[PDB]
Design an enzyme around this catalytic site. Structure first.
Site, PDB file in Angstrom:
ATOM      1  N   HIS A   1       0.835  -1.221   0.000  1.00 40.62           N
ATOM      2  CA  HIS A   1       0.000   0.000   0.000  1.00 40.62           C
ATOM      3  C   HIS A   1       0.861   1.258   0.000  1.00 40.62           C
ATOM      4  O   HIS A   1       0.420   2.359  -0.345  1.00 40.62           O
ATOM      5  CB  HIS A   1      -1.034   0.003   1.138  1.00 40.62           C
ATOM      6  CG  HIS A   1      -0.489   0.384   2.482  1.00 40.62           C
ATOM      7  ND1 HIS A   1      -0.321  -0.530   3.499  1.00 40.62           N
ATOM      8  CD2 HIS A   1      -0.117   1.584   2.991  1.00 40.62           C
ATOM      9  CE1 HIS A   1       0.144   0.086   4.572  1.00 40.62           C
ATOM     10  NE2 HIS A   1       0.284   1.368   4.287  1.00 40.62           N
TER      11      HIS A   1
ATOM     12  N   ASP B   1      -0.929  -7.428   1.563  1.00 46.15           N
ATOM     13  CA  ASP B   1      -0.185  -6.163   1.747  1.00 46.15           C
ATOM     14  C   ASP B   1       1.303  -6.410   1.947  1.00 46.15           C
ATOM     15  O   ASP B   1       1.845  -6.349   3.045  1.00 46.15           O
ATOM     16  CB  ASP B   1      -0.754  -5.338   2.909  1.00 46.15           C
ATOM     17  CG  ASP B   1      -0.346  -3.874   2.841  1.00 46.15           C
ATOM     18  OD1 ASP B   1       0.262  -3.453   1.825  1.00 46.15           O
ATOM     19  OD2 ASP B   1      -0.630  -3.139   3.818  1.00 46.15           O
TER      20      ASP B   1
ATOM     21  N   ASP C   1       0.879  -0.307  20.126  1.00 47.85           N
ATOM     22  CA  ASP C   1       0.624  -0.645  18.721  1.00 47.85           C
ATOM     23  C   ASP C   1       1.663  -0.050  17.797  1.00 47.85           C
ATOM     24  O   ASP C   1       2.431   0.838  18.161  1.00 47.85           O
ATOM     25  CB  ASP C   1      -0.773  -0.136  18.324  1.00 47.85           C
ATOM     26  CG  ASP C   1      -1.371  -0.872  17.125  1.00 47.85           C
ATOM     27  OD1 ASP C   1      -0.795  -1.871  16.649  1.00 47.85           O
ATOM     28  OD2 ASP C   1      -2.453  -0.448  16.658  1.00 47.85           O
TER      29      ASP C   1
ATOM     30  N   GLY D   1       2.992   5.467   9.636  1.00 48.39           N
ATOM     31  CA  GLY D   1       4.398   5.800   9.426  1.00 48.39           C
ATOM     32  C   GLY D   1       5.302   4.606   9.591  1.00 48.39           C
ATOM     33  O   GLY D   1       6.462   4.628   9.206  1.00 48.39           O
TER      34      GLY D   1
ATOM     35  N   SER E   1       4.263   1.487   8.589  1.00 44.00           N
ATOM     36  CA  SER E   1       3.861   0.480   7.608  1.00 44.00           C
ATOM     37  C   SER E   1       5.074   0.054   6.808  1.00 44.00           C
ATOM     38  O   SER E   1       5.897   0.861   6.392  1.00 44.00           O
ATOM     39  CB  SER E   1       2.751   0.994   6.670  1.00 44.00           C
ATOM     40  OG  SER E   1       1.507   1.110   7.347  1.00 44.00           O
ATOM     41  N   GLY E   2       5.137  -1.248   6.616  1.00 38.50           N
ATOM     42  CA  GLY E   2       6.138  -1.907   5.781  1.00 38.50           C
ATOM     43  C   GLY E   2       7.316  -2.417   6.576  1.00 38.50           C
ATOM     44  O   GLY E   2       8.163  -3.164   6.097  1.00 38.50           O
TER      45      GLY E   2
HETATM   46  N1  LIG Z   1      -2.574   1.060  13.127  1.00 40.87           N
HETATM   47  C1  LIG Z   1      -1.969   1.478  11.946  1.00 40.87           C
HETATM   48  C2  LIG Z   1      -0.737   0.927  11.613  1.00 40.87           C
HETATM   49  C3  LIG Z   1      -0.115   1.323  10.450  1.00 40.87           C
HETATM   50  C4  LIG Z   1      -0.751   2.264   9.649  1.00 40.87           C
HETATM   51  N2  LIG Z   1      -0.398   2.841   8.455  1.00 40.87           N
HETATM   52  C5  LIG Z   1      -1.375   3.730   8.099  1.00 40.87           C
HETATM   53  C6  LIG Z   1      -1.294   4.490   6.849  1.00 40.87           C
HETATM   54  C7  LIG Z   1      -2.158   5.504   6.379  1.00 40.87           C
HETATM   55  N3  LIG Z   1      -1.727   5.882   5.205  1.00 40.87           N
HETATM   56  N4  LIG Z   1      -0.595   5.131   4.869  1.00 40.87           N
HETATM   57  C8  LIG Z   1       0.124   5.259   3.689  1.00 40.87           C
HETATM   58  C9  LIG Z   1       1.512   5.247   3.709  1.00 40.87           C
HETATM   59  C10 LIG Z   1       2.206   5.384   2.523  1.00 40.87           C
HETATM   60  C11 LIG Z   1       1.512   5.526   1.331  1.00 40.87           C
HETATM   61  C12 LIG Z   1       0.125   5.529   1.323  1.00 40.87           C
HETATM   62  C13 LIG Z   1      -0.614   5.707   0.025  1.00 40.87           C
HETATM   63  N5  LIG Z   1      -1.539   4.621  -0.299  1.00 40.87           N
HETATM   64  C14 LIG Z   1      -2.832   4.915  -0.561  1.00 40.87           C
HETATM   65  O1  LIG Z   1      -3.234   6.068  -0.489  1.00 40.87           O
HETATM   66  N6  LIG Z   1      -3.670   3.915  -0.887  1.00 40.87           N
HETATM   67  C15 LIG Z   1      -5.024   4.133  -1.174  1.00 40.87           C
HETATM   68  C16 LIG Z   1      -5.549   3.605  -2.349  1.00 40.87           C
HETATM   69  C17 LIG Z   1      -6.879   3.795  -2.663  1.00 40.87           C
HETATM   70  C18 LIG Z   1      -7.694   4.513  -1.805  1.00 40.87           C
HETATM   71  C19 LIG Z   1      -7.173   5.039  -0.635  1.00 40.87           C
HETATM   72  C20 LIG Z   1      -5.841   4.851  -0.317  1.00 40.87           C
HETATM   73  C21 LIG Z   1      -0.578   5.396   2.498  1.00 40.87           C
HETATM   74  C22 LIG Z   1      -0.334   4.266   5.876  1.00 40.87           C
HETATM   75  O2  LIG Z   1       0.680   3.366   5.939  1.00 40.87           O
HETATM   76  C23 LIG Z   1      -2.375   3.733   9.029  1.00 40.87           C
HETATM   77  C24 LIG Z   1      -1.991   2.806  10.041  1.00 40.87           C
HETATM   78  N7  LIG Z   1      -2.549   2.391  11.182  1.00 40.87           N
END
Ligand SMILES: Nc1ccc2[nH]c(-c3cnn(-c4cccc(CNC(=O)Nc5ccccc5)c4)c3O)cc2n1
Ligand SMILES: [Ca+2]
Ligand SMILES: [Cl-]
Ligand SMILES: [Cl-]
Ligand SMILES: [Cl-]
Lengths: 58, 250
Positions: free
Chosen positions: B41, B90, B182, B186, B188-189
């Protein structure tokens, strides 16, 4: 011995064989010891080891 | 990371920071000198693939201490089954343009064999999650690499204990339901790393959800074990032109 139990006694990876046979294996950068279960590094920076900690106890 | 601690410099040496146009994008995990595992993502909205950077040996974002190693990302590989803006499948495999140099501060995490992961690792209660993510739900991100010990739950138990996200076989639950601890936006990955008999392995990837440390809810992580063979095959493959590659899964 069987891999599903106690990891077949293997430190790392385990393979079941035909019979009451088992083979342990090690990740790249490791070698299997003569005990047939233990893995020892063969390189400076093997995966999944933390140098500063390995040293800390060396 | 919410409710963790600073990972002492060098104690999280497989941790990757992904940047786009110099801005924090996501986390990642080094598994070899040229291979990084992240979350699909992270790349959903990527416009200019040519400005993706992976940083190894990072710790404190405020300074340069010379242990850092930056590489351009040459390839981003995502499974065919992944749908942008969702959580299932993911996962992403990144090929670096040039290998990183292994040092005290840069070391790969072991990608385990599937069997080993499923039969053994999956039963190790506690594992570490890390990143430079938000320190709080709706909070500021960390300047120093943070780390958190989280316990894994069997999916049945997770569902029972929870009170929405659908938990697939390609996921697992880890953490706490009391809203104290948790991974977060930020992060993620980043890695979910599991210790066994003196060695650390990759078992999970920080995915995403709505908010962080939400009472009555656990963290949901990509179940790496489902992807071992997929990853291994890719790593044996020759590069292809164009950064983004969708690869069939299984
Ligand atoms: N508890 C937690 C643990 C880990 C979490 N990580 C996130 C979060 C939010 N936004 N991103 C993010 C990062 C980097 C690029 C992006 C772009 N990707 C799209 O925008 N896709 C998308 C596609 C279609 C529609 C909407 C979105 C999104 C996240 O990692 C919430 C969270 N909560
Ligand atoms: Ca730094
Ligand atoms: Cl480069
Ligand atoms: Cl090929
Ligand atoms: Cl391209």
């Amino acid at each position: 011995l069987i891999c599903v139990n106690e990891n077949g006694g293997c430190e790392q990876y385990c393979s079941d064989h035909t019979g009451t046979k088992r083979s342990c294996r090690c990740h790249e950068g490791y070698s299997l010891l003569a005990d047939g279960v233990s893995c020892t590094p063969t390189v400076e920076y093997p995966c999944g080891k933390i140098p500063i900690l390995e040293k800390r106890n060396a | 990371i919410v409710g963790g601690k600073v990972c002492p410099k060098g104690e999280c040496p497989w941790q990757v920071l992904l940047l786009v146009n110099g801005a924090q994008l996501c986390g990642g995990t080094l598994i070899n000198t040229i291979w990084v595992v992240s979350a699909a993502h992270c790349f959903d909205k990527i416009k200019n693939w040519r400005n993706l950077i992976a940083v190894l040996g990072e710790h404190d974002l405020s300074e340069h201490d010379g242990d850092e190693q930056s590489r351009r990302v040459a390839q981003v590989i995502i499974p065919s089954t992944y749908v942008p803006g969702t959580t299932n499948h993911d996962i992403a495999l990144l090929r670096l343009h040039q290998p990183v140099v292994l040092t005290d501060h840069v070391v790969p995490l072991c990608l385990p064999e599937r069997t080993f992961s499923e039969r053994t690792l999956a039963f190790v209660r506690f594992s570490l999650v890390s990143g430079w993510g938000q320190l709080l739900d709706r909070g500021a991100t960390a300047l120093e690499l943070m780390v958190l010990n989280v316990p894994r739950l069997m999916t049945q138990d997770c569902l029972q204990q929870s009170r929405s996200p659908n938990i697939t076989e390609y996921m697992f639950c880890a953490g706490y339901s009391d809203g104290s601890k948790d991974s977060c936006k930020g992060d993620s990955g980043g890695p979910h790393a599991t210790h066994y008999r003196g060695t650390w392995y990759l078992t999970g990837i920080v995915s995403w959800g709505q908010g962080c440390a939400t009472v009555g809810h656990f963290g949901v992580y990509t179940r790496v074990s489902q992807y071992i063979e997929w990853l291994q095959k890719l790593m044996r493959s020759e590069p292809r032109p164009g950064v983004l590659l969708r690869a069939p899964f299984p």
